[PDB]
């Protein structure tokens, strides 16, 4: 239909478009590299290649697909690997025995031929149906019940509903009548990669994410269907925190969409998806591959794919949230995504605003990060899901005033700022307890009250102790520990106890692999109770003794409790919640006995 | 004492609801009376509709 | 009046014209009478509008 | 009597801009409506116009535009706005579409946004006082009617929560001294969660009659975020001068407004200004702030309290420095106080108001207000110094007065600084609380307090 005029890397001009649609996908050249329009100039158009562009020719045909970028939504997406162009990588590797990905390969996102069982939800002929009505369910695998739903822009009366049976994707199962037309339907539905899926209503979040890490779960809680921000450091986080979301998270599904990353890390993690099963179900061991989907685009991938992959991932997440399942989206991108925006702006010759980043970076980041929340779905029956976003930014070593970082912290409510010093200190969680913050605190008030009313005050006390330690660290560095008082001494002891027992979670050991909230709250309660008892003891300071003398005494006389407070970390959660609660209650009772007999002896 | 005050507050809320309903009825009556001016406003519009000339 | 105003505002040599199928005949009667009015309104050669 | 001309000469679509080919005499900022080929309706604003060629920036993005099948209807009106008394008690989108599930407003009159500036002769000095509710601002750095005070803050500090608290607890001091008060709350680029927080706060406010809430989400188009302060200040000007009502305007996270200005300036393909931000930001923020004042002719006045986020947790950033140069106050949000978990993280020592003397008086506020303000400020500085001294010397070498200053600082942080998010204190009550803090010092120790005023209240 049209022919190329100008080729410069990802940018390819195609004269002869005349009537063409903004962001309409167009195939370029004999190999048919799929690309989207970015800049109309008249009859001419500008197309990002989305592939390797070497070897084009002037007058090579360019065809219009007339449709914007879309990803095939349907049964069979779970446990699959897709590029930003929604290409099943394992399917490509199997169909074509060559280890490479051939240039301009055209493979359907989901195999039509593959069979799947069906289960209508007592649907009757002639019933009026609306978009998003969960008329039937399909078990893609154990513990995964894909409830097929009507497309959002679809409604009518059910003239025909298929009986339950084995069907391929190309097969039609549902027929609707509306306004005197008949509309057939297959399981697979297409949805634009932009323009988020419609939502009946947005709801205020109520439940925390309850991640394995202690600091993430207590100091900086995050609600279900809420934004997150991590600096994407190595060693931990994108390896540790990500593993915690993958197997230790209460989210039903994980959509890992890493883009612009180290290739070997994704090779390893893809080798890890089939393995590393988690026995979350009572009677079965849920292999994480069932509850994950990898959108993998390594650094060698084309630049436009770096922009496309994020929207593909968020579209998949919105799809899953439509069924009511709570799904988490971890994104190792948005670090290199800004670089991709810089590149496309530079080729398009747009004028950058700050440090070479195009201005609409902030707007696009705001859109993507606001595409997540707790949502009441469309159709019947009434159901509710959520999407939780965890997106990386520049590594913590660089300045946190970087435009991408500044844009993210504007909209993101929870920043889990990792510390380079902590990483060098080999402190594995590496979460800084000063820069990090979770604005979601006020919402979780009811949850914390119903769980444990005393938790709020002890958390505030722990925060105050940490702040005091950080504040007077400068003083003790300058002046010295000689002037430190008994209150300062117990404050430093409690701060060290926190830094060692509480904020540190190795996660490579069964006792530290996962820390349930009940164990975390008890450990914090024990630490705060010990701090309070020490405060009261040094405050009493009577009987020709006490204060710093009392502090030294309780350091030596009550050294056993202080030592086993550290071992409280080693208490194995697998032993069972009632046993751990009993053990911690006994420890608390002994701590109360401590500083009470020490009170009786009056030093 | 709180139960007595709460009964009084519930009665006050009901009375306020009734007063608001009465005020809304009065406002609806005034708006309906405005239809008299609306009838002439229609032909005023028609006049300013056809002011288009040349 | 409407034709004359539209011709004045649009101010181009040749135009098209779309009106309801009914009353097209009296529209035709209005046509040319307006064209002359337009040509007289401003010192321009009368347009091609033969709509 | 004039009808729109529906052009269909879309030639060239570049980024967030669409270019028309042959437009007969376009206006510069004539608002313009675009019908997609699919029939979707999207609005836009006409940018710089050349000879018969006009470039248009459209809202809701440029997706779906085709050169052949998109038509552009020219309204020819420069972004008028309907404004009326009944606009109160309703929530409006960034452009102004009612989102409160209510009827569209019936216009009393159509007003031009970015209204023409006040003749400086008509300006008058700030007078009276207004209860922010938060005792720290009410006492340390008070705000009077007609004074523009920004509130510097950083990401992660509860700037928005404090703004909502101010919205709830705002009221004239003159009531205590013995309904013209109104708030135009414009929120620019707020997140979805904060949007729900504001919506719920308005639903259970109990003060809807005196509050109007302009809301512009992050997902909203950037140009809408630009125009939101304009329409907000226009409505405030109508409700204040044309309606004789004291008006308190709160603008939250104007850094988003500055970013949107940067975006549109880049769209113009103009060279970026110094330090990245556009050069015209000074004039823009001046136009935004300077609309606040007291008109001699009209009894109503305007108070401006922008909530400007300071990037990188400092005021060295171009926007905080620029707004500090333009405005006449600086209240601060200390990161440590939030870290130490004091719900009002107000940094009292950095806090200051240039016109504090004018706000405090005998007729408005109590006579001892300024005296206790100065005394508390000096005593708090002394308490911080004595805390450092106790740290360095071990607290044994301290005298009795040093311990007095220490306990005063502790009680101050425990009671005066920390306020319930829903707890409301009249300025008289705040002064009483400050006095109760003051009784712990001896009478002679309150050096700053004038004589015959100390004995007036220190007696208790």
Burial string for A13-51 (b: 16+ CB within 10 Å, else e) reads bbbebeebbbbbbbbbbebbbbbbbbbbbebbbbbbbbb
DSSP state of A498: I
Helix orientation angle between D400-411 and D368-393, rounded to the nearest 10 degrees = 120
Q: Is C39 on the interface with B (CB under 8 A)?
A: no
Buried b (16+ CB within 10 A) or exposed e, A252-284: bbbbbbbbbbeeeebeebbeebeeeeeebeeee
**Nearest CB partner across the interface for A22, out of D65, D217, D263:** D65
Q: What is the DSSP string of D107-150?
A: PSEEEESSPPPPPGGGEE--BS-EE-S-HHHHHTT---BT----
Q: Which helix (H) or strand (E) holds A527?
A: helix A517-540
List own/partner pairs for A496-500 with CB under 8 A and 24 or more apart: A497/A527, A497/A530, A497/A562, A497/A565, A497/A566, A498/A462, A498/A465, A498/A466, A498/A527, A499/A427, A500/A566
C-beta separation of D318 from D277 below 8 A: yes
Q: Alpha carbon of C32 to those of C4, C42, D271: distances in Å?
A: 10, 16, 54
**A324 to chain D, minimum CA–CA distance in Å?**
20
- Both structure tokens of A303: 């630049």
Q: Which residues contact B26 (CB under 8 A, 6 or more apart)?
A: none
Decide: A195 and A412 in contact? Cβ < 8 Å.
no
CB D401 within 8 A of CB D385: no
* C-alpha span between D188 and D225 (Å, rounded): 6
DSSP letters for D4-60: -EEE--EEEEETTEEEES--SS--SS-EEEEE-TT--EEEEEEEEE-SS-EEEEESS
On chain A, the residues whose CB falls within 8 A of the CB of D11 are 42
- Give the whole-angstrom CA distance, residue C27 versus residue C46: 18
Q: Is-contact D251 A330, C-beta < 8 A?
A: no
Q: Of A111, A412, A472, nearest to D156 (Cα)?
A: A412
CA atoms within 13 A on the CB side of D376: 32
First-last CA distance in chain C: 17
How many angstroms separate the CA atoms of A87 and A109, rounded?
Answer: 5
Residues 6+ apart with CB under 8 A from A250: A209, A210, A224, A326
Interface list for D 10-49 with C (CB within 8 A)? 24
Nearest to D16 by CA among D223, D210, D167: D223
What number of other Cβ atoms are within 10 A of residue A420's Cβ? 15
The dihedrals phi and psi of A33, each to the nearest 5 degrees, come to -70, 120
Chain A residues within an 8 Å CB radius of D340: 463-464, 467
Q: Residue A127, class by beta-carbon neighbours within 10 Å (0-12 exposed, 13-18 middle, 19+ buried)?
A: middle
Q: Is D452 part of the contact surface with chain C (CB cutoff 8 Å)? A: no
Instruction: Please report all neighbours of B, defined by 3+ CB atom pairs within 8 A.
Output: C, D
Taking CA atoms, what residue in B is nearest to D1?
B52
Short-list D375, D69, D370, D57, CA closest to D221: D57
| Closest alpha carbon within chain A to D11 | A42
> With an 8 Å Cβ cutoff, is D106 touching chain B?
no
The residues after which chain B has a C–N gap greater than 2.5 Å are none
The Cα–Cα gap between D145 and A202 comes to: 39
DSSP-based three-state secondary structure for A224: coil
Angle at A305 between CA A302 and CA A310, to 5 degrees: 150
Helices (H), A390-516: 403-411, 420-424, 445-451, 455-478, 486-497, 510-513
Pairing relationship of beta strands A292-295 and A81-82 according to DSSP bridges: parallel
Which residues on chain D are in Cβ contact (under 8 Å) with A68? Answer: 63-64
Q: How is A44-110 classified by DSSP, letter by letter?
A: -EEEE-SS--TT--TT-EEEE--S--EEEESTT-TT-EE-TT--BHHHHHHHS-SSS--TT----SS
Radius of gyration of chain A (CA): 28
Write out chain B residues lying below 8 Å of D1, CB-based. 48, 51-52
Integer CA distances (angstroms), D91 to A491, A602, D96, D186, D211, in order: 49, 64, 9, 10, 9
A321: burial class by Cβ within 10 Å (0-12, 13-18, 19+)?
buried
CB-CB neighbors (< 8 A) of D24 in chain C? 9-11
Residue in D127, D179, D138, D128 with CA at minimum distance from that of residue D429: D138
Separation CA A254–CA A272 (nearest Å): 14
Instruction: Give D373-407 as a 3 state SS string.
Output: HHHHHHHHHHHHHHHHHHHHHCCCCCCHHHHHHHH
B and C: number of Cβ contacts within 8 A: 10
CB atoms within 10 A of CB A242: 21
Please answer yes or no on whether D272 and A351 come within 8 Å at the CB atom: yes
Residue A63 phi, psi (nearest 5)? -115, 145
Q: How far apart are CA A273 and CA A288, in angstroms?
A: 6
Residue D240 sits at φ, ψ, to 5 deg, of: -100, -55
**Token pair 């309660």 is at which residue?**
A525
Distance CA B36, CA B29 (A): 12
Look at residues D163, D154, D134, D166 and name the one whose alpha carbon lies nearest to residue D333: D154
The contacts of residue D72 (CB under 8 Å, 6+ apart) are D6, D7, D8, D9, D10, D18, D20, D32, D33, D34, D35, D56
Q: CA-CA distance, A89 to A87, in Å (whole number)?
A: 6
Q: By the 8 A CB rule, do A264 and A296 touch?
A: no
Triad A372, A374, A376: Cα angle to 5°: 120
Question: HSE of D46 in the Cβ direction (CA atoms, 13 Å)?
Answer: 24
User: Chain C residues within 8 A (CB-CB) of chain D?
Assistant: 9-11
């Amino acid at each position: 239909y049209g022919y190329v005029r100008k080729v410069s890397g990802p940018v390819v001009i195609a004269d002869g478009m005349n009537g063409a649609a903004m962001y309409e996908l167009v195939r370029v050249g004999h190999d048919n590299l799929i690309g989207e329009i970015i800049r109309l100039e008249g009859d001419s158009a500008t197309i990002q290649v989305y592939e390797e562009t070497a070897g084009l020719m002037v007058n090579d045909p360019v065809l219009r697909t007339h449709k914007p970028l879309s990803v095939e939504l349907g049964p069979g997406i779970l446990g699959n690997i897709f590029d930003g162009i929604q290409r099943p990588l394992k399917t490509i590797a199997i169909r074509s025995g060559d280890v490479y990905i051939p240039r301009g390969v055209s493979v359907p996102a989901l195999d039509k031929d593959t069979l799947w069982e069906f289960q209508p939800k007592k649907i009757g002929e002639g019933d009026l149906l609306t978009g998003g009505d969960l008329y039937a369910t399909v078990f893609e695998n154990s513990l995964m019940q894909h409830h097929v739903a009507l497309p959002p822009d679809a409604m009518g009366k059910v003239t025909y509903v298929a009986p339950a049976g084995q069907y391929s994707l190309k097969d039609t199962v549902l027929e609707l009548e509306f306004q005197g037309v008949k509309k057939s339907f297959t399981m697979l539905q297409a949805w634009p990669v932009r323009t988020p899926r419609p939502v009946s209503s947005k709801l205020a979040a109520d439940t925390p994410l309850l991640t394995g890490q202690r600091v993430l779960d207590a100091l900086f809680p995050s609600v279900l269907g809420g934004t997150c921000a991590i600096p994407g450091a190595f060693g931990c986080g994108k390896t540790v925190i990500s593993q915690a979301l993958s197997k230790y998270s209460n989210s039903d599904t994980v959509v890992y969409v890493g883009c612009g990353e180290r290739g070997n890390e994704m090779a390893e993690v893809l080798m890890d998806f089939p393995q590393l099963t988690m026995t979350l179900p009572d009677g079965r061991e849920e292999s994480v591959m069932k509850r994950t989907t990898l959108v993998a685009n390594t650094s060698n991938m084309p630049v436009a794919a770096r922009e496309a992959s994020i929207y593909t991932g968020i579209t998949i997440a919105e799809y899953f949230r439509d069924m009511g399942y709570n799904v988490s989206m971890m994104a190792d991108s948005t670090s290199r995504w800004a670089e991709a925006l810089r590149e496309i702006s530079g080729r398009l010759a747009e004028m950058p605003a700050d440090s070479g980043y195009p201005a609409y970076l902030a707007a696009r980041l705001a859109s993507f990060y606001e595409r997540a929340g707790k949502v009441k779905c469309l159709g019947g029956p009434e159901r509710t899901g959520s999407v939780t976003i965890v997106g990386a930014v520049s590594p913590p070593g660089g300045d946190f005033s970087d435009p991408v970082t500044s844009a993210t912290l504007s909209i993101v409510q929870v920043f889990w700022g990792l510390d380079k010093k902590l990483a060098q200190r080999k402190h594995f969680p590496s979460v800084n307890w000063l820069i990090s913050y979770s604005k979601y605190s006020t919402a979780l008030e009811s949850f914390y009250e119903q769980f444990d009313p005393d938790f709020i005050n002890i958390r505030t006390k722990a925060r105050e102790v940490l702040q005091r330690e950080d504040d007077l660290n400068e003083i003790v560095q300058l002046v010295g520990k000689d002037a430190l008082a008994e209150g300062d001494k117990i404050t430093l002891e409690t701060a060290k106890l926190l830094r060692e027992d509480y904020l540190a979670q190795n996660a490579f050991t069964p006792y530290d692999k996962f820390c349930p909230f009940y164990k975390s709250v008890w450990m914090m309660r024990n630490i705060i109770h010990f701090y309070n008892l020490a405060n009261q003891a040094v405050e009493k300071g009577a009987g020709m003794d006490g204060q710093k003398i009392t502090y030294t005494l309780i350091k030596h006389r009550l050294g056993d409790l202080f030592y086993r407070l550290v071992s409280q970390k080693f208490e194995d959660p697998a032993e069972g919640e009632p046993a751990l609660v009993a053990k911690f209650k006994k420890l608390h009772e002994d701590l109360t006995a401590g500083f009470r007999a020490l009170e009786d002896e009056t030093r | 004492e709180f139960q007595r005050k709460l009964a009084e507050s519930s009665g006050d809320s009901g009375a306020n609801v009734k007063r608001l309903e009465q005020e809304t009825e009065v406002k609806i009556h005034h708006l309906n009376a405005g239809a008299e001016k609306i009838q002439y406003d229609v032909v005023q519009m028609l006049l300013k509709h056809v002011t288009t000339v040349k | 009046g409407l034709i004359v105003q539209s011709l004045l505002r649009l101010k181009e040599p040749a135009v098209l014209l779309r009106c309801r199928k009914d009353d097209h005949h009296l529209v035709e009667s209005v046509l040319e009478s307006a064209k002359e009015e337009y040509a007289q309104k401003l010192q321009v050669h009368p347009p091609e509008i033969l709509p | 009597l004039e009808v729109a001309m529906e052009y269909r000469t879309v030639t060239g679509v570049a980024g967030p801009l669409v270019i028309l080919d042959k437009v007969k005499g376009p206006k510069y900022y004539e608002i313009v409506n675009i019908r997609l080929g699919d029939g979707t309706m999207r609005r836009g604003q006409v940018l710089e116009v050349d000879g018969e060629k006009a470039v248009v920036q459209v809202f809701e993005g440029t997706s779906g535009i085709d050169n052949k099948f998109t038509t552009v209807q020219f309204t020819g009106e420069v972004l008028k706005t309907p404004v009326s008394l009944d606009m109160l008690g309703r929530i409006f989108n960034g452009s102004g579409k009612p989102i409160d599930n209510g009827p569209p407003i019936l216009p009393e009159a159509y007003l031009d946004i970015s209204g023409s500036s006040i003749n400086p002769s008509e300006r008058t000095y700030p007078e009276e006082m207004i209860q922010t509710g938060i005792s720290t601002i009410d006492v340390m750095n008070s705000i009077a009617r007609g004074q523009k005070i920004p509130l510097f803050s950083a990401a992660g500090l509860p700037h928005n929560e404090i703004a909502a608290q101010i919205c709830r607890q705002a009221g004239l001091v003159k009531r205590l001294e013995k309904d013209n008060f109104a708030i135009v709350f414009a929120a620019m680029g707020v997140n979805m969660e904060t949007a729900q927080f504001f919506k719920r706060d308005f639903e259970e406010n109990g003060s809807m009659e005196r509050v109007t809430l302009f809301l512009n989400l992050a997902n909203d188009p950037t140009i809408e975020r630009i125009i939101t302060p304009r329409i907000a200040l226009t409505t405030a000007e109508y409700l204040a001068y044309e309606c004789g009502k004291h008006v308190l305007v709160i603008l939250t996270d104007m850094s988003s407004y500055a970013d949107a200005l940067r975006e549109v300036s880049a769209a113009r393909e103009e060279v970026p200004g110094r330090r990245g931000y556009p050069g015209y930001m000074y004039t823009d923020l001046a136009q935004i702030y300077e609309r606040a004042g007291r008109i001699e002719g009209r009894k109503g006045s305007i108070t401006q309290i922008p909530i400007l986020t300071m990037p990188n947790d400092d005021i060295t950033h171009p926007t905080p420095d620029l707004t500090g140069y333009i405005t006449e106050g600086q209240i601060y949000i200390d990161r440590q106080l939030q870290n130490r978990q004091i719900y009002p993280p107000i940094n009292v020592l950095p806090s200051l108001s240039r016109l504090m003397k004018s706000a405090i008086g005998e007729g408005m506020t109590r006579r001892d207000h300024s005296d206790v303000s100065n005394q508390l400020y000096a005593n708090y500085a002394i308490g911080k110094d004595v805390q450092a001294m106790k740290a360095v010397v071990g607290e044994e070498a301290l005298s009795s007065e040093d311990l007095l200053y220490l306990e005063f600082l502790d009680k101050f942080e425990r009671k005066f600084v920390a306020q319930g998010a829903y707890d409301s204190r009249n300025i008289f009550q705040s002064l009483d609380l400050a006095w109760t803090l003051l009784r712990i010092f001896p009478r002679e120790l309150l050096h700053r307090i004038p004589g015959k005023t100390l004995d007036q209240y220190y007696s208790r």
